[PDB]
Amino acid sequence: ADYNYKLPSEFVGCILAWNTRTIDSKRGFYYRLFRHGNIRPYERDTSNV
Amino acid sequence: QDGCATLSTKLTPTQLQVNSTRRGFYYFDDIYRSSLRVLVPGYFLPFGTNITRYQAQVINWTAIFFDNPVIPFNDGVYFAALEHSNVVRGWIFGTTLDNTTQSAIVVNNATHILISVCYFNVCKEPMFAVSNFKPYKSWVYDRANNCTFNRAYPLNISTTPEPGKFKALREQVFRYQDGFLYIYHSYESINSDTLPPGFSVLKPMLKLPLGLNITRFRVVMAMHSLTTSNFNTHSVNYFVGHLK
Amino acid sequence: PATVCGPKQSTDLVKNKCVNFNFNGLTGTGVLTDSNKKFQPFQQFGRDS
Numbered sequence: 078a079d080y081n082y083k084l085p086s087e088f089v090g091c092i093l094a095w096n097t098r099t100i101d102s103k104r105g106f107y108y109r110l111f112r113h114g115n116i117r118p119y120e121r122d123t124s125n126v
Numbered sequence: 127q128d129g130c131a132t133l134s135t136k137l138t139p140t141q142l143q144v145n146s147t148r149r150g151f152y153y154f155d156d157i158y159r160s161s162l163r164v165l166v167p168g169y170f171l172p173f174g175t176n177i178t179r180y181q182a183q184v185i186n187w188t189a190i191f192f193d194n195p196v197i198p199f200n201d202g203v204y205f206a207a208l209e210h211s212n213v214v215r216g217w218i219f220g221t222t223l224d225n226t227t228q229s230a231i232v233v234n235n236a237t238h239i240l241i242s243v244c245y246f247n248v249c250k251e252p253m254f255a256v257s258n259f260k261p262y263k264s265w266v267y268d269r270a271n272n273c274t275f276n277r278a279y280p281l282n283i284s285t286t287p288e289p290g291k292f293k294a295l296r297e298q299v300f301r302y303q304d305g306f307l308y309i310y311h312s313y314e315s316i317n318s319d320t321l322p323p324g325f326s327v328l329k330p331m332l333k334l335p336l337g338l339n340i341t342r343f344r345v346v347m348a349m350h351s352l353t354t355s356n357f358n359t360h361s362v363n364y365f366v367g368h369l370k
Numbered sequence: 371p372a373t374v375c376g377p378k379q380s381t382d383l384v385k386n387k388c389v390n391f392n393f394n395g396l397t398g399t400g401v402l403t404d405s406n407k408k409f410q411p412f413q414q415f416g417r418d419s
């Protein structure tokens with residue numbers, strides 16, 4: 078919620094989630110772990126510096 | 127996307143200052159109202175403030191001096207342009223404006239309006255090129271990779287210059303909120319060489335989901351299009367102001 | 371203009387009677403008559419003071 082994907086406080090909409098163990102159990106999925114400051118709502122950071 | 131171009135004839139920008147009269151108001155919401163008087167807080171350009179002016183033309187000494195510095199984009203920008211030959215095609219939005227961060231380009235190819243977001247390698251001088259009167263090449267960047275957004279709207283515009291007096295004034299307002307870039311537009315045809323005083327209100331035009339950190343922009347002057355193999359520029363003026 | 375709508379069945383326009391109505395999810399009760407008002411091209415309803 079701080080470095081990857083942030084929703085605005087006045088959100089209107091639905092959220093769905095489901096398990097995908099049998100199709101997505103592989104290498105190649107990453108998330109950002111270090112960053113200077115938080116991102117703003119509906120923003121993306123694709124840098125790899 | 128073709129790439130590269132170099133200009134030595136350049137000179138220092140002058141950075142004039144001009145009065146803003148009562149321009150730079152826009153429709154701030156999507157609620158229809160009828161015969162009502164309202165009090166609204168927001169971000170607007172104050173009446174009577176100074177704003178900055180830049181120009182572009184060949185003066186006389188076998189040399190052309192443009193004016194494309196890098197400007198801050200804090201809380202929003204008011205843009206104006208006086209032109210007569212389809213000069214100012216687009217802008218560049220971003221943070222470092224190099225190949226280490228994502229950037230957004232809004233331009234015109236005299237056939238479509240293009241909006242793209244990618245890891246751009248910007249050139250030293252972005253501009254298009256016409257073949258006297260034929261869209262020739264475009265030298266705005268040489269390489270673009272790892273790229274997120276692409277969209278185009280067909281809009282064919284005339285590429286035959288009519289130099290002389292100023293025939294068009296175009297005004298824009300740029301805002302950024304919650305990953306959305308908001309563009310408001312207004313246009314008119316006048317016959318004068320300054321900005322007339324008055325009160326103009328700008329209509330909404332575009333709401334784009336870019337999702338990119340914006341703190342700085344610069345202007346693309348694709349003016350050089352009217353020659354053969356040598357490529358030089360006609361005249362144009364533009365104005366910049368901020369929001370409070 | 372509505373771009374995504376739910377699966378509902380439409381009925382006939384009944385005029386000059388006190389009825390319940392549902393126009394694109396806008397619900398109410400009253401009497402429906404012809405109009406001489408003018409709208410903007412992308413406007414769907416009008417509201418008074």
Ligand SMILES: C=CC1=C(C)/C(=C\c2[nH]c(/C=C3N=C(/C=C4\NC(=O)C(C)=C4C=C)C(C)=C\3CCC(=O)O)c(CCC(=O)O)c2C)NC1=O
Pocket residue numbers: 214215216232233234239281282283296311313331
């Ligand atoms: C990038 C394109 C761009 C355009 C066209 C724009 C919007 C825009 N420019 C218009 C007029 C215009 N004014 C311009 C000039 C421009 N061409 C440019 O590259 C720039 C910056 C402008 C700014 C307006 C053009 C091309 C027209 C004529 C459009 C037509 O033929 O209808 C109009 C009214 C006519 C129409 O709906 O087409 C719109 C909506 N804002 C932009 O930034």
Ligand SMILES: *[C@@H]1O[C@H](CO)[C@@H](O[C@@H]2O[C@H](CO)[C@@H](O[C@@H]3O[C@H](CO)[C@@H](O)[C@H](O)[C@@H]3O)[C@H](O)[C@H]2NC(C)=O)[C@H](O)[C@H]1NC(C)=O
Pocket residue numbers: 123124125272
């Ligand atoms: C921009 O695009 C390029 C090309 O798609 C991306 O390059 C790829 O980056 C990944 C790492 O994010 C590389 O994976 C690594 O490869 C090395 C061996 O080369 C390996 O030792 C590491 O363990 C890891 O597997 C991948 O090879 C690389 N591919 C290419 C063709 O360059 C780049 O990441 C993109 N940048 C972004 C994030 O926008």
Ligand SMILES: *[C@@H]1O[C@H](CO)[C@@H](O[C@@H]2O[C@H](CO)[C@@H](O)[C@H](O)[C@H]2NC(C)=O)[C@H](O)[C@H]1NC(C)=O
Pocket residue numbers: 145146147148174323324
């Ligand atoms: C900046 O522009 C505004 C708008 O034209 C000028 O305001 C006018 O000033 C004159 C002289 O005081 C008044 O008679 C008008 O009634 C004013 N009109 C409006 C709408 O404000 C203002 O004077 C200009 N300022 C400068 C320094 O040029």
Ligand SMILES: *[C@@H]1O[C@H](CO)[C@@H](O)[C@H](O)[C@H]1NC(C)=O
Pocket residue numbers: 143174175176
């Ligand atoms: C506007 O410009 C004038 C002249 O440079 C300057 O004196 C004034 O402080 C500036 N600010 C206003 C009033 O917009």
Ligand SMILES: *[C@@H]1O[C@H](CO)[C@@H](O)[C@H](O)[C@H]1NC(C)=O
Pocket residue numbers: 224225247269
């Ligand atoms: C990025 O730009 C720098 C400076 O021009 C250059 O040295 C480097 O090779 C470029 N790298 C890419 C991503 O093309």
Ligand SMILES: *[C@@H]1O[C@H](CO)[C@@H](O)[C@H](O)[C@H]1NC(C)=O
Pocket residue numbers: 127235237240264
């Ligand atoms: C401009 O249009 C031409 C012809 O369709 C196309 O070849 C070219 O890639 C376009 N350039 C830009 C900058 O969009």
